[PDB]
Amino acid sequence: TYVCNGNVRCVELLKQYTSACKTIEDALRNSAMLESADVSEMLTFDKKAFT
Amino acid sequence: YKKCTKGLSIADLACAQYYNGIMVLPGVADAERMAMYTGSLIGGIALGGL
Amino acid sequence: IPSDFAFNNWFLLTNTSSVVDGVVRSFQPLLLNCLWSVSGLRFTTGFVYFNGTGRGDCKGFSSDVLSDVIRYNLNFEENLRRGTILFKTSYGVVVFYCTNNTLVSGDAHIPFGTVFYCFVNTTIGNETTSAFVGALPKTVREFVISRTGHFYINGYRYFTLGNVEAVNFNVTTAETTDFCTVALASYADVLVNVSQTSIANIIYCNSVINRLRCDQLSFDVPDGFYSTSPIQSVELPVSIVSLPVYHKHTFIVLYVDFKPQSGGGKCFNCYPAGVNITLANFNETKGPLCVDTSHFTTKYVAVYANVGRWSASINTGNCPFSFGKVNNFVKFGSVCFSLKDIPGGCAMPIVANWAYSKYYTIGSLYVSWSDGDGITGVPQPVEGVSSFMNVTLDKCTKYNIYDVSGVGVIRVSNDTFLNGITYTSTSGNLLGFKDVTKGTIYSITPCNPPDQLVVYQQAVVGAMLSENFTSYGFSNVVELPKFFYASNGTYNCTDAVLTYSSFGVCADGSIIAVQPRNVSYDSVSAIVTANLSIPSNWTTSVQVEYLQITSTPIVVDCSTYVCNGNVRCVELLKQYTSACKTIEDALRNSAMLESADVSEMLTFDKKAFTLANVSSFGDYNLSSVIPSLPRSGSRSAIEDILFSKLVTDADYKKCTKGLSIADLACAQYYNGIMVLPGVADAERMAMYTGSLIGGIALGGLTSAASIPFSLAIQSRLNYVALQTDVLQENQKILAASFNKAMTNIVDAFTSQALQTVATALNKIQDVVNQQGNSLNHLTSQLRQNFQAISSSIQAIYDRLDIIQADQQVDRLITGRLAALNVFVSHTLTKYTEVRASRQLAQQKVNECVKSQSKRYGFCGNGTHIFSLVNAAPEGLVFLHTVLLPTQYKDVEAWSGLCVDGRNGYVLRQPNLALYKEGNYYRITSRIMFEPRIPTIADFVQIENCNVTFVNISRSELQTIVPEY
Amino acid sequence: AIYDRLDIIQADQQVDRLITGRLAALNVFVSHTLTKYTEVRASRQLAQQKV
Amino acid sequence: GSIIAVQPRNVSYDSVSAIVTANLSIPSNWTTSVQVEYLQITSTPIVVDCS
Amino acid sequence: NECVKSQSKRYGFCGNGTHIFSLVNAAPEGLVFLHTVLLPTQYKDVEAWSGLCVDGRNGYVLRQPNLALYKEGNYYRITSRIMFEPRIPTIADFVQIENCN
Amino acid sequence: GVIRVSNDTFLNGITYTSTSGNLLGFKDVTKGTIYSITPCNPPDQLVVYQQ
Amino acid sequence: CNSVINRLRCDQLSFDVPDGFYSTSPIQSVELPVSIVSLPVYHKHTFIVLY
Ligand SMILES: *[C@@H]1O[C@H](CO)[C@@H](O[C@@H]2O[C@H](CO)[C@@H](O[C@@H]3O[C@H](CO[C@H]4O[C@H](CO)[C@@H](O)[C@H](O[C@H]5O[C@H](CO)[C@@H](O)[C@H](O)[C@@H]5O)[C@@H]4O)[C@@H](O)[C@H](O[C@H]4O[C@H](CO)[C@@H](O)[C@H](O)[C@@H]4O[C@H]4O[C@H](CO)[C@@H](O)[C@H](O)[C@@H]4O)[C@@H]3O)[C@H](O)[C@H]2NC(C)=O)[C@H](O)[C@H]1NC(C)=O
Ligand SMILES: *[C@@H]1O[C@H](CO)[C@@H](O[C@@H]2O[C@H](CO)[C@@H](O[C@@H]3O[C@H](CO)[C@@H](O)[C@H](O)[C@@H]3O)[C@H](O)[C@H]2NC(C)=O)[C@H](O)[C@H]1NC(C)=O
Ligand SMILES: *[C@@H]1O[C@H](CO)[C@@H](O)[C@H](O)[C@H]1NC(C)=O
Ligand SMILES: *[C@@H]1O[C@H](CO)[C@@H](O)[C@H](O)[C@H]1NC(C)=O
Ligand SMILES: *[C@@H]1O[C@H](CO)[C@@H](O)[C@H](O)[C@H]1NC(C)=O
Ligand SMILES: *[C@@H]1O[C@H](CO)[C@@H](O)[C@H](O)[C@H]1NC(C)=O
Ligand SMILES: *[C@@H]1O[C@H](CO)[C@@H](O)[C@H](O)[C@H]1NC(C)=O
Ligand SMILES: *[C@@H]1O[C@H](CO)[C@@H](O)[C@H](O)[C@H]1NC(C)=O
Ligand SMILES: *[C@@H]1O[C@H](CO)[C@@H](O)[C@H](O)[C@H]1NC(C)=O
Ligand SMILES: *[C@@H]1O[C@H](CO)[C@@H](O)[C@H](O)[C@H]1NC(C)=O
Ligand SMILES: *[C@@H]1O[C@H](CO)[C@@H](O)[C@H](O)[C@H]1NC(C)=O
Ligand SMILES: *[C@@H]1O[C@H](CO)[C@@H](O)[C@H](O)[C@H]1NC(C)=O
Ligand SMILES: *[C@@H]1O[C@H](CO)[C@@H](O)[C@H](O)[C@H]1NC(C)=O
Ligand SMILES: *[C@@H]1O[C@H](CO)[C@@H](O)[C@H](O)[C@H]1NC(C)=O
Ligand SMILES: *[C@@H]1O[C@H](CO)[C@@H](O)[C@H](O)[C@H]1NC(C)=O
Ligand SMILES: *[C@@H]1O[C@H](CO)[C@@H](O)[C@H](O)[C@H]1NC(C)=O
Ligand SMILES: *[C@@H]1O[C@H](CO)[C@@H](O)[C@H](O)[C@H]1NC(C)=O
Ligand SMILES: *[C@@H]1O[C@H](CO)[C@@H](O)[C@H](O)[C@H]1NC(C)=O
Ligand SMILES: *[C@@H]1O[C@H](CO)[C@@H](O)[C@H](O)[C@H]1NC(C)=O
Ligand SMILES: *[C@@H]1O[C@H](CO)[C@@H](O)[C@H](O)[C@H]1NC(C)=O
């Protein structure tokens, strides 16, 4: 999306360099999921506290 | 963005981001649980093991 | 294709040098059409005409299709069978001679199996030429040739031909079991895993799962959220919106005259061609032409149907614009093309084809231009009426509005938008345009919004979409507010097997409102009358952590890494030493700094050495974590499993000799990336981890031996609170839970605890990925030449004389030093971050491990008992045993009662609280139900008695509290 | 518009120098995201550590 | 110039032990040793005019 | 503001041992400190009991973790876990426990 | 560099190159034997003491 | 700049280089016979000449 902009040809050429990009987007994705895990872990909910 | 790719309004800046692929994820501390949490703790300030 | 098919005879096909032991997605002719079983192929093999006439079974799926490719895989023993090879092709016949004997004619047999002067006669037109066999194949196990004519034998294609019609495998077979099969097949796209010259398996890229998996460049992609854009690329009508103007005729035209010399093989004397420009009339006074007005038009006309095998075309000369698309909404000003050559303009190459054998290059009119807005091109020849503004709204469209091209659906919008004709976004893509005729406006909605989808258990169930639609094989795909959720499976919403920050997902695909982990913690409260709950029966749960503690030390020689051993590059580099010298000095001193720091942390105790003995643990059977007993010499199961998973340190001295091909790490020495032996190398690192791990059950003592562990742990916990129990069942149940965490969690290697270990494992694999792709990012920045002709400095010297050699050499070194400073600055950011995390790790091993902190939320998410520790790839891992609430214990608590007399009690220290279990009073802790005997040492006097409080005199206080 | 301007071969040439530069800036951005992650990690430690 | 197997700094620290019958060692006669530290506390403020 | 003003109760923080106080000066764009500290130089032998409980229903456990008895002679003294200081024995640090071994 | 005789089938292809792109070894056309390439000038690390 | 010490010191662009570990590649640059490995093909005469 960010580089092809929806272009099929740019997609085909990009795919051969996936390893770099795939690594990039995997890093940011896993780190997003990591930090989301971390926050969710911090997140707690109490029925006593609600009221 | 699902609701801004239709309708009679010109898309907002954030919607333009979806169009360009900068998918801004809904915030981890989205309003619902974030508020439930901030509330749970803020009540935990005057609430103790009881 | 069968699964588990060994296909050992089949092989990979590579244009360039073959890779080893890697997985790559690629296009291969793998859509097998007809097996065409050999069935003992005899001397009269037969001719294939690119047809399904194959003597074979179709194996169900992919039964029969137009056969696009023919291959000759060979399955036979190491035997010589008399044979000949004859090739039939459109150009003409090809015959192959050979002679096993040294004589050129010799004996006309191609060697079969392992292994001669052979020749080939190729007749083209009426001319016959002879080709030398040259190199003799050791053994041919798979042969291949295409229609397009590419020929690869196990890769490294020697050449490629024009095309072919038929073939014959003129092999006389003495053996009855000559072959199993020899087939025809068709192209496809697949992926390939080959290891150490042996293929493992492949994955067709058909399903959604297999599609994304192919994109993952692996097998069995793990569960998670991934982005897909499945929008159909099928061409659709494209609406045009334009600005009103009466179109003057500004369309370029062309003519050509190609003398028709025979386009067959025999073009010994073949004529050239002369083209005459048809764009406009030329007066030789002024060479350049002009534009009548600012209008959109361009066309190309030519005649090429003059020869049997001829095509004439132009690609691009020295100017960017590609002729023939000039009409595709291009805008220029006063380009003023001229046939006669003039400066400041590009030229265009013209070429003629004769079956690709020879290119009859000619040069047509060079094209000149000026930067402007007037000249323009439209695919339609005439737009003079100026009422043509094609418009499709809801359908997918391609659009050009006022020279802006995009793809999407036009949505009618009603807004004044009086500022200007059009508005573009921050990126620059137009959002909407107001119509010239009436002031109405149309927004542009993107045609192909990106889609997010979820795969679970190697299956895609559920997808996050913007449309209310069921796109799955299951039954129901519900809707949602402000956003939609796609899962075609039924919704019983029994329970959620997946959890994201803003949603939850059932095993069946039912969506659930994100529910945060429900936890009921207990916090201290002021002296009050209430019914209270204390944690009583705990069992221990390992909460695994991973701590970065160093980074892999790396040193780079300026000369090695940039010169590559080149003396000339060394001489030029030396003048810029100050920068590089500063760089390598910084990284070197910082390496020595961090090595000093670790060594300073490193300690060794003779008392501790022995403490790794298995006798100390007793019933605990910690064993796995226990450092192994010295094997008649002067390492734990987890560290070993982790090492066994080190997939995806030695001395290069021993790999620059020997019969083995060098390993990847050895290649690093060759390229000058001298990876230093790890500071915490195995020897002292292990001696240290052992010394401390024994220091956990070893305290300041005269001897160097162990103490019974059962009495020993009691002390670490006492730091948190005074144990008044004698018989510790918790020990044995925490051992059963601990070793069950090791059984199960170590099986996970090879309960929220499981989430913790999943996080830690993902963290270690993260740090291994980040280091791998860091140095791979470096060695790929060496794989790329910023501006050079090529990356090889040597080959550059071959290519170039000194002066311009130095020019591209130093632009290379400037870019390499730039990336190198980037890398050393990432090393410095890694140093400051590994310094913070060293502070923290060093800060917790010496505290939490040695003496439980009084800070809850630090280590253990509750009352903490002690922590284990081991080594890990470039980091530490700990196992903080802790005490948490499992069963609460009811109690009643008074409101800090003051005695009726002037005596009245307030708290002597905040961490205790009375309660009334019965007539007698006991003062259990705020962190356990331990029944501390009541005692005066914790009392205080306060006058003001609230009658609502205890009724006791100072005398029977002794009968109430056993103060003395 | 580059595809409109260009035939495949040199189209791929300017396309891939584009993507090389875009991936370069993109790695710059993901590395600033990683520096932001390590810093927001320190400050998460501290915030989480004070609440 | 003789090479030696890296020996880490030998140190015999003392850590607390649970109530037990044993012969124990307490530090008695100390003399003070300065352990110098250096702490970054600011950075050299710099301003640049675009023009 | 901490270690300098009031010695931390965290060993391994400042001084690599028992810490006494810290000096401070300025430096190019930074600070430098001189953390005076107390470290082991000469150990002092002692004998320590296994948290003995009295024969009567009275029996002793530790009132706070940082001390330890020892038997220097017939009389008992309760030196700290961080020094050989001879704290006079005292009831303020005692507790009762029935089970006598 | 110096060519070192190597004995391995290496049946995948004629030649193999490293991650950098420098060839590691090549198999002979005549007989299937292969030769590894060992770097001519390995970098050296040296220590200076008391000048 | 004759001795090893004075050689590295000249590279240090200073005097009395402090004690430490430094990288040197002293391999002789003297020209040596260079072996050639090639792919079998009967060479047609494709050599440019000049007058
Ligand atoms: C080693 O080097 C050699 C060269 O020395 C490489 O060989 C080349 O490889 C490329 C692909 O990497 C080949 O291009 C492909 O040609 C395929 C054959 O199709 C031919 O006929 C069809 C129908 O008439 C034409 O459309 C093709 O292309 C022609 O027309 C297009 C129009 O745009 C022109 O641009 C071309 O110049 C031609 O004039 C061919 O003549 C062809 O099927 C294939 O197309 C698929 O892949 C592309 C890219 O993804 C898609 O855009 C296209 O839609 C097809 O993709 C789908 O098609 C299949 C059909 O089964 C569907 O099932 C799937 O959905 C699939 O995704 C492409 O055009 C090139 O021809 C070839 N050179 C020669 C002469 O053989 C090797 O690849 C290389 N190997 C290594 C190891 O790198
Ligand atoms: C590519 O191939 C497989 C995935 O299917 C992975 O490597 C292969 O793993 C199999 C496991 O069955 C190995 O088979 C075993 O090899 C050992 C070693 O000789 C042998 O003792 C056993 O009897 C069994 O045959 C196979 O050798 C191995 N192939 C390799 C290493 O090339 C690998 O993960 C796959 N690649 C990826 C990353 O997809
Ligand atoms: C055989 O191949 C030829 C092409 O040479 C084709 O014309 C014919 O249709 C094929 N026959 C069958 C039965 O497929
Ligand atoms: C096969 O080759 C033999 C000799 O090599 C020849 O006698 C025979 O005619 C050939 N047959 C065909 C069908 O080419
Ligand atoms: C080509 O074939 C002819 C006869 O078919 C033969 O005389 C000639 O020697 C062949 N060319 C060679 C062997 O190079
Ligand atoms: C080829 O056929 C032979 C029979 O001669 C058989 O032994 C061998 O297994 C086959 N090779 C395969 C299936 O790869
Ligand atoms: C444009 O409009 C005309 C008439 O409505 C039609 O003939 C033509 O096909 C249309 N073309 C496109 C691309 O919309
Ligand atoms: C085209 O070619 C013919 C003959 O080759 C010539 O008479 C004519 O002037 C040329 N140009 C145009 C624009 O017709
Ligand atoms: C969503 O799609 C379903 C499927 O047909 C349809 O019944 C429903 O009316 C649609 N709702 C909206 C708001 O588009
Ligand atoms: C799920 O819902 C379907 C349809 O309402 C129902 O038939 C089925 O019994 C339900 N299953 C469970 C486990 O609730
Ligand atoms: C969290 O809340 C639900 C709501 O009633 C309750 O059933 C459950 O006991 C709580 N969680 C656990 C693990 O007990
Ligand atoms: C809970 O407290 C009330 C008074 O606050 C008391 O009467 C009751 O007995 C307590 N609960 C139990 C189980 O004793
Ligand atoms: C729970 O605690 C009580 C109190 O000591 C004990 O009697 C009981 O056996 C414990 N139960 C378990 C399962 O540990
Ligand atoms: C470990 O201790 C046991 C008993 O404490 C003893 O039998 C054994 O010899 C010890 N290990 C070694 C290596 O001596
Ligand atoms: C625990 O002890 C038993 C017997 O001593 C032994 O068989 C078992 O292997 C030990 N546990 C582990 C994990 O080795
Ligand atoms: C003290 O006791 C009185 C009853 O006489 C009551 O009204 C008041 O709330 C109490 N105040 C406290 C407990 O602070
Ligand atoms: C460290 O160990 C050696 C080994 O016997 C010992 O001689 C020495 O006393 C220790 N180090 C110091 C500084 O005392
Ligand atoms: C060491 O302890 C033993 C008993 O554990 C004791 O007999 C001995 O006297 C102690 N050492 C000294 C020097 O008193
Ligand atoms: C060591 O400590 C003892 C105990 O006070 C003291 O008498 C002796 O003088 C001290 N020695 C030194 C050198 O400080
Ligand atoms: C190449 O080989 C020939 C014969 O072995 C010899 O005359 C020539 O000098 C050699 N040259 C090189 C550069 O090895």
Residue F23: its H or E element: strand F18-27
Residue with token string 């070894």: G25
How many angstroms away from the CA of B2 is the closest CA of chain A? 17
CA C705 to chain centre: 50
- Taking a C-beta distance cutoff of 8 angstroms, is the pair C709, C616 a contact? yes
**Residue C692 CB neighbours (<10 A):** 21
| Nearest Cα to Cα of residue C257 among C317, C306, C190 | C306
Half-sphere exposure of C473 (CA within 13 A, CB side): 5
Residues on chain H touching C559 (C-beta within 8 angstroms): 25
Resolution (in Å) of the shown entry?
A: 3.5
The letter for the amino acid at C672 is G
Ligand nearest to the CA of C475: 10
d(CA C432, CA C422): 6
Ligand nearest to the CA of H37: 20
CA of H38: which chain C residue's CA is closest? C135
SS (H, E, C) E1-51: CCCCCCCCCECCCCCCCCCCCEEEEEECCCCCCCEEEEEECCCCCCCCCCC
Interior angle at CA C155, CA C153 and CA C156, nearest 5 = 100
- Taking a C-beta distance cutoff of 8 angstroms, is the pair C724, C931 a contact? yes
d(CA A25, CA F15): 45
- Taking the alpha carbons of G9, G13, G18, G21 in that order, is the dihedral positive or negative? positive
| Nearest Cα to Cα of residue C601 among E31, F16, E35 | F16
Half-sphere exposure of C244 (CA within 13 A, CB side): 7
- Taking a C-beta distance cutoff of 8 angstroms, is the pair C34, C52 a contact? yes
Do C19 and G16 make contact, defined as CB atoms within 8 angstroms? yes
Q: Residues lining ligand 8, CB < 6 A?
A: C 255, 257, 276, 278
Residue with token string 């494209």: C238
- Give the E-state strand segments of C113-196 in sequence order: 119-124, 127-132, 142-145, 150-151, 159-160, 166-171, 184-195
**Strand partners for F47:** E23
Q: Six-digit token pair at C244?
A: 């009103």
Residue H22, classed as helix, strand or coil, is: strand
User: In this complex, which chains have at least 3 CB pairs below 8 Å with chain A?
Assistant: B, C, D
Name the residue facing C229 among A1, A36, A39 (closest C-beta). A1
- Taking a C-beta distance cutoff of 8 angstroms, is the pair C462, C485 a contact? yes
Q: Phi and psi at residue C521, in whole multiples of 5°?
A: -80, 170
Provide the edge-to-edge strand list for the sheet that holds C511-512.
C496-500, C503-506, C511-512
- Taking a C-beta distance cutoff of 8 angstroms, is the pair C409, C445 a contact? yes
**Residue F56 CB neighbours (<10 A):** 9
Residues on chain B touching A35 (C-beta within 8 angstroms): 28
CA of H6: which chain G residue's CA is closest? G51
- Taking the alpha carbons of C849, C854, C858, C860 in that order, is the dihedral positive or negative? positive
* Residues in contact with C702: Cβ distance below 8 Å, sequence separation at least 6, in sequence order: E22, E23, E24, E25
Q: How far is the CA of C468 from the centre of ligand 9 (A)?
A: 6
d(CA C377, CA C842): 70
**CB of residue C615 inside a 6 A radius of ligand 14:** yes
Q: Do chains E and C touch (3 or more CB pairs under 8 A)?
A: yes
CA C242 to chain centre: 44
Residue D15, classed as helix, strand or coil, is: helix
d(CA C618, CA C616): 6
Q: What is the DSSP letter of C856?
A: T
- Deposited experimental method: cryo-EM
d(CA C659, CA C897): 87
Task: Flag whether residue F12 sits within 8 Å of chain C, measured between CB atoms.
Answer: yes
How many angstroms away from the CA of C584 is the closest CA of chain H? 10
Residues after which a C–N gap over 2.5 Å breaks chain C: 115, 634, 648, 750
Q: What is the DSSP letter of C857?
A: T
* Residues in contact with G45: Cβ distance below 8 Å, sequence separation at least 6, in sequence order: C674, H21, H22, H23, H24
CA of H27: which chain C residue's CA is closest? C565
Do D34 and A31 make contact, defined as CB atoms within 8 angstroms? yes
Residue C171, classed as helix, strand or coil, is: strand
Pocket-testing residue among E26, E29, E32, ligand 19, by greatest number of atoms within 8 A of Cβ? E29
Do C937 and F97 make contact, defined as CB atoms within 8 angstroms? no
Which F positions 50-79 lie with beta carbon below 8 A of chain C? 61-63, 65
d(CA C893, CA C535): 15
Residue C82: its H or E element: none
